């Protein structure tokens, strides 16, 4: 009866992505919507009768601190609580807002910010450094990482950073506003670092390949010259990092609020930022960290380089 937008978050492990194998995030969401009585059962079976859309089709294993979806529901009392009561702890609806009927979240959002949490031995040189959990990131290596990541900034032909895309395809070009790596931190004897990237839009496997290539370079499996060569017309076999560390941090609506905001209303989750950071630190990060500690996801992939 009313078109709403939802701010939600989830740990991606144990799912096969957001949309569409294991269950998906939307499977849990739909079930929670049906059980709570926000939508009738047929709206859950056919996700078009409630006009359901999602901003980011996060891949298998990928987490999200600020996923955004839009749909029509029965605005039942305490709707946020009710929906959450049918969800596991690792999926939370953080915010809800009533929007105009014509609002399409996927078609209206601009830039996305992702982070990538990884063990620091992903930057350990294969010839000079230890290759296990005992490795500690040096200041010089971090400088190298940030120097390389900075080269991604601006507009480039990113055809080598996805699949089945030609160099002459205009849609292969993408815009990177920012990319860097934060200072490392230790948790339970393991050192991690957070890579953050902001882009106007991303192609399939793009961030994982951007990270993978820099990892290959820093570790010494590829010369630095391959980076600048990668945005040329030539094809480059770019390594694809695991999806475990990848987290969707924010879906931006700044350009939407400017261009459309003045049949449309401004969308802003600034008030829910506390819950966003809380869920990331309490449910997203610890699962990634624990998984790396016990299953050695990154280490296994690094072996294949
Ligand atoms: N929408 C294309 C993919 C973007 C990256 C991230 N959302 C993922 O699927 O892993």
Numbering used by the authors: 83 to 102, 108 to 349, 352 to 394
What do the authors say?
One of the first identified was the pseudouridine synthase 1 (hPus1p), which is a member of the TruA family despite their low sequence similarity (<20%;). We determined the structure of the catalytic domain of ΔhPus1p and the D146A mutant of this enzyme. The atomic model shows the typical fold for a pseudouridine synthase from the TruA family.
Crystals of ΔhPus1p belong to space group P212121, with two molecules per asymmetric unit. The region preceding the C-terminal helices of hPus1p (residues 348–352) is described by weak electron density, and so this region was built in molecule B of the ΔhPus1p structure only. If we superimpose our structure of the ΔhPus1p enzyme onto the bacterial TruA dimer, it clearly shows that the mammalian enzyme cannot form a dimer. In molecule A, the carboxyl group of the lysine molecule forms a hydrogen bond with the backbone atoms of residue D146, while the lysine amide group is bound to the hydroxyl group of residue Y201. In molecule B of the same crystal form, the backbone of the glutamate compound is hydrogen bonded to the hydroxyl group of residue Y201, while the main chain and the side chain of residue R295 stabilise the OE1 and OE2 positions of the glutamate. The side chain of the glutamate points towards residue R295 of α5, while the lysine NZ atom faces residue R144 of the catalytic loop. None of these bound molecules form hydrogen bonds with the catalytic aspartic acid D146 side chain.
